Amino acid sequence: MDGYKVEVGKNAYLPCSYTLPTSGTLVPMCWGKGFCPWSQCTNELLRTDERNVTYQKSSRYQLKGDLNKGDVSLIIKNVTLDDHGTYCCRIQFPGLMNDKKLELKLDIK
């Protein structure tokens, strides 16, 4: 997987995006701290549905781009060493095994 390095105390930016059709319904998605599981996300940080965010773990975890344009990039504020590891961005396109699953490594420097 591709890796990111963020200094302690700084904000981690993890990019994730999908093609949203003109006047398209939003595709639900989740961020989790782990490898992408079979269904949804593990260790949920942020979740959306067809309209908007539906779950946010804490104020530290924020969608940094505009989900309404298909930019579902995550910011994690004020990182510590405990924030290191594998992250999953999962875009839940309708239908069996249609999900777009992205895993990124975050390292803390």
Q: Where are the domains of the chain?
A: 1-109
Name which of 36, 35, 30, 33 is nearest 16 in CA terms: 30
Residue type, 8: V
Residues 6+ apart with CB under 8 A from 89: 14, 16, 29, 30, 31, 72, 74, 101, 102, 103, 104
Q: State the resolution, in angstroms.
A: 2.0
Q: Which fold has domain 1-109?
A: Immunoglobulin-like (2.60.40)
**Sheet of strand 44-48: strand arrangement:** 2-6, 100-108, 85-91, 29-32, 44-48, 53-56
Residues 6+ apart with CB under 8 A from 15: 73
Phi and psi angles of residue 52, each rounded to the nearest 5 degrees, phi first:
-175, 180
* DSSP character string of 20-72: --TTPPPPPEEEESSS--SSS-SSEEEEE-SSSEEEES-TTEEE-S-GGGTB-
Q: Does residue 90 contact residue 29 with C-beta atoms inside 8 Å?
A: yes
